[PDB]
Design a protein around this ligand. Sequence first.
Ligand SMILES: Nc1nc2c(ncn2[C@@H]2O[C@H](CO)[C@@H](O)[C@H]2OP(=O)(O)O)c(=O)[nH]1
Ligand SMILES: [Ca+2]
Length: 104
Amino acid sequence: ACDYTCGSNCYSSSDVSTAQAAAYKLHEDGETVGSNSYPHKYNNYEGFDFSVSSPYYEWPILSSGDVYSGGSPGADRVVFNENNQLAGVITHTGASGNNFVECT
Ligand SMILES: Nc1nc2c(ncn2[C@@H]2O[C@H](CO)[C@@H](O)[C@H]2OP(=O)(O)O)c(=O)[nH]1
Ligand SMILES: [Ca+2]
């Protein structure tokens, strides 16, 4: 079973922790990856009720199992905060335009 299901993509907690760890390191060092400059701030326009406090940052989580290193980010993202706490896992899949819905 999946801990997080984003459309057809299935993720486990370990997939999320690995992705998040790489993103937080880049965040602490002030470095970015890709044309969209990940990780970058997630404004939470959707108004998701996260358990952890703002500010939030987003990083792509890939169905391939590899950690993002540039190129297409896919539709899935891991959202984390300043204290490296997982806020949630979201996706463009099943959401209109460039909006987001939570992964179940
Ligand atoms: N829908 C949405 N997009 C956001 C938010 N914060 C940042 N973005 C980014 O804003 C732009 C327009 O939606 C996109 O670059 C999207 O990023 P990603 O595609 O990199 O996730 C947010 O809270 N909601
Ligand atoms: Ca996996």
